[PDB]
Amino acid sequence: VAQGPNGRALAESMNPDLLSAIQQHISIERYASVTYLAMSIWCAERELAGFYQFFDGEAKDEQSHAVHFTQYLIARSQSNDLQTLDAPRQNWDSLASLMATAFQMEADTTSSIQSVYALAERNSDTRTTVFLAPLIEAQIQSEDQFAYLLGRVKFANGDPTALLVIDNELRAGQTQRG
Amino acid sequence: VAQGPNGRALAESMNPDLLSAIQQHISIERYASVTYLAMSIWCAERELAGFYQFFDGEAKDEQSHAVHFTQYLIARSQSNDLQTLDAPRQNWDSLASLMATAFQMEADTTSSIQSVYALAERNSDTRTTVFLAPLIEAQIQSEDQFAYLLGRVKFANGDPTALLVIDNELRAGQTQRG
Amino acid sequence: VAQGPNGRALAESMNPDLLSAIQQHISIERYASVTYLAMSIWCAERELAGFYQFFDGEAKDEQSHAVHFTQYLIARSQSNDLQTLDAPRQNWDSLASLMATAFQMEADTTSSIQSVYALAERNSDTRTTVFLAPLIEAQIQSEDQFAYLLGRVKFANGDPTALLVIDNELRAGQTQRG
Amino acid sequence: VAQGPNGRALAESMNPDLLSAIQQHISIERYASVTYLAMSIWCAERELAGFYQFFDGEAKDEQSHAVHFTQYLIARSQSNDLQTLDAPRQNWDSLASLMATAFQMEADTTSSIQSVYALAERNSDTRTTVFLAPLIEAQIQSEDQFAYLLGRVKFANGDPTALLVIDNELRAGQTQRG
Lengths: 178, 178, 178, 178
Ligand SMILES: [Fe+3]
Ligand SMILES: [Fe+3]
Ligand SMILES: [Fe+3]
Ligand SMILES: [Fe+3]
Ligand SMILES: [Fe+3]
Ligand SMILES: [Fe+3]
Ligand SMILES: [Fe+3]
Ligand SMILES: [Fe+3]
Prior knowledge:
This is part of a larger assembly, with 4 copies of chain A.
Chain A: H1 16-45, H2 49-75, H3 95-122, H4 126-156, H5 160-171
Helix pairs in contact in A: 1-2, 1-3, 2-5, 3-4
The complex binds fe (iii) ion (8 copies).
Organism (chains A, B, C, D): Synechococcus sp. (strain CC9311)
Protein name (chains A, B, C, D): Ferritin
Keywords (chains A, B, C, D): Metal-binding
């Protein structure tokens, strides 16, 4: 039995380019987490308590996704390499602009997973393509959810009254089309 | 065993300037109470039933704070001196202006506690600094809450529709960022 | 009513040096979080599942502490500034060496809070000294806990059998002297 | 409606090389089952009751996997061909050597599934690639589990005391990192 780079017994070697891609994706998830924390703060600063609660939860969820990927590398007997984390964006001129950044962040997270998936396919690392598939499935739902929240905020057309109504929806947990 | 100014057994003498400062602070809490009663009435007169209920409760809470301080003086064997209470402010041109006065009242209550705290520190009255600390902690949360209510009302920008929505939030007990 | 740097109504201005100190401390808590994640991974890589679970939980707790501080800045109407986060230490030659780093990390977190506390005292920012006191109290218990875990691991003197026994204690939630 | 090789109505024909690959994989699962039975016996002969119970359960699970594949061939209207089963390995010089064989057996089971998956992909048999994906996902977890058990036994470094502790973990159902 061979030992993998992290010292554990190795079921199947992993291409170093694929390993680096997964390590970079962990950074993307961690960056999404701190971005949603920054968005939660921006919303709290403007008394948008429902949006604050929503993004506070999204920050914790993205971190959980990051840890899920670190656990996969452990399972593959590959080394983890936790990287320096950039500071998030922290300033927006409107809730609509913040929600656009949030949607882009969610789409960019999927694009990063898809890039890892394509590289796994090129290397015939079927454990990795199989591992990623339900995460891509979850990303479709998150993209649908963020398109819903962004579209509903844009529908409000900057009316504070409409934004208060939506804020109360989010506080109540009404965060998707259902 | 020595007897304190209120006749009870005295654990530790208190500087008369610190005693006067605590007696004055009791008046501040009582004045905050009647101010919030006046605000409750102003809101009821304009059918803002959620704001009326909120301030009715704040009035009772501020009175409870006042009594809490009278109990501390009893515990320190110091005399209480319940003072003449000024009439509250009763007229505002808008809910936003009323909420600004409410926030200032809450901040001024903290500033009064802090002044008592500093005087206790100068006199090394550690019983008093310790007694006041959790009250200052509670004031941070109240200041956060009143900044939230004021900021949400200002966000409404005088739209009656938005103010009705916020009024219903307060009636439901949704009074903080959470 | 004045507006604070983050745009909310301002109860009491804050010295910019104290604000920077709190922002830096948020970074310390975030760095403790990612350090404990790195330690959790190191333990998982060596099948020390109880230590892995323990540090996984500590990572989430430190992040919660960081968010608690961001909420205080919001409450004080001060700006948050989420910073670039250094990569954690990731390599240790023994569990005993890892636990020494963990204890030092916990002690250094307290030292950072104490430095903020002293600066608040110099500026007479009593809201901040009061806010920090229960966090310092919690740090005493965490330091006691980490001294216990480090000391118990050192008692094992590198015996894998003893380390397996302690690992099972941690998996069971037996993480303190009690 | 056409009839498949096993006589049932045929939804989609299957390449004979892919059919043979699935039949061979059923043999791999059956061989893993009898290998884990042999390991269960080896452990029972040395009073390692927790390891005996663990491998007794793994033997039954591998057999269930084999039956799951026979059911897929039935569903595809393909013939099953239950093959002669080799005798398992039965002798090891140490628990650590047995656990190495167990890990290799688990990894080899995944490699066999991956080979079937690749052949299905080459033939565009999407029913089969989809059917196999959750089985590959389960194999990642089993490989992680067996790397954990092997690594924990190797950490014991042949100390009977440490092996008794781990044996009791397995009897209690503590068989993964968690
Ligand atoms: Fe994510
Ligand atoms: Fe996301
Ligand atoms: Fe009060
Ligand atoms: Fe008050
Ligand atoms: Fe902390
Ligand atoms: Fe800590
Ligand atoms: Fe199997
Ligand atoms: Fe298996």
